[PDB]
Design an enzyme around this catalytic site. Structure first.
Site, PDB file in Angstrom:
ATOM      1  N   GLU A 210       0.862  -1.207   0.000  1.00 41.68           N
ATOM      2  CA  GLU A 210       0.000   0.000   0.000  1.00 41.68           C
ATOM      3  C   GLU A 210       0.895   1.253   0.000  1.00 41.68           C
ATOM      4  O   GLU A 210       0.637   2.122  -0.850  1.00 41.68           O
ATOM      5  CB  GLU A 210      -1.000  -0.026   1.161  1.00 41.68           C
ATOM      6  CG  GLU A 210      -2.113  -1.035   0.991  1.00 41.68           C
ATOM      7  CD  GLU A 210      -3.143  -0.764  -0.105  1.00 41.68           C
ATOM      8  OE1 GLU A 210      -3.087   0.307  -0.753  1.00 41.68           O
ATOM      9  OE2 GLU A 210      -3.973  -1.654  -0.338  1.00 41.68           O
TER      10      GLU A 210
ATOM     11  N   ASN B  12      -7.534   8.675  -6.037  1.00 39.78           N
ATOM     12  CA  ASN B  12      -8.418   7.660  -6.674  1.00 39.78           C
ATOM     13  C   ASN B  12      -9.169   8.333  -7.839  1.00 39.78           C
ATOM     14  O   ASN B  12      -9.350   9.576  -7.809  1.00 39.78           O
ATOM     15  CB  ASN B  12      -9.385   7.041  -5.659  1.00 39.78           C
ATOM     16  CG  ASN B  12      -8.681   6.402  -4.476  1.00 39.78           C
ATOM     17  OD1 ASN B  12      -7.698   5.696  -4.666  1.00 39.78           O
ATOM     18  ND2 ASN B  12      -9.170   6.629  -3.262  1.00 39.78           N
TER      19      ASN B  12
END
Ligand SMILES: [Au+]
Ligand SMILES: [Au+]
Ligand SMILES: [Au+]
EC number: 3.2.1.17
Length: 129
Positions: free
Chosen positions: A35, A46
């Protein structure tokens, strides 16, 4: 802060992530590796305009307020900047809420793609825990 592998293992264990919702410590270390590369300052936008924050890339769409994800939720009741500190407390306590919500660690795309089903124990190999 960029954590060493065994350093993060030890912090995550101290913060009670060791078998939290049945997910062994290696799963959490593996997730944090893929991550954030163990970097508490990591931020990634995003497609939907939300942003992922911190060592566990927690999403402004649901979990924190970053003042630029309009019509989102703040289910961890924090500003997303709290998720970027050298102290992982806020990231861990919020992760516990996420993993508990019925989707388990599948909420972490990097966990699902790179950790799930693999020998995650390798991630705590050599550490004094
Ligand atoms: Au904690
Ligand atoms: Au900590
Ligand atoms: Au995770």
């Amino acid at each position: 802060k960029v954590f060493g592998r065994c350093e993060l293992a030890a912090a995550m264990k101290r913060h009670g992530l060791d078998n939290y919702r049945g997910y062994s410590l290696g799963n959490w270390v593996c997730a944090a590796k893929f991550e954030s590369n163990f970097n508490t300052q990591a931020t990634n936008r995003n497609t939907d305009g939300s942003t992922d924050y911190g060592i566990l890339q927690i999403n402004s769409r649901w979990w924190c307020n970053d003042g630029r994800t309009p019509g989102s939720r703040n289910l961890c009741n924090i500003p997303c900047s709290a998720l970027l500190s050298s102290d992982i407390t806020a990231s861990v306590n919020c992760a516990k809420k996420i993993v508990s919500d019925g989707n388990g660690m599948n909420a972490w795309v990097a966990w699902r793609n790179r950790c799930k089903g693999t020998d995650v124990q390798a991630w705590i190999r050599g550490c004094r825990l």
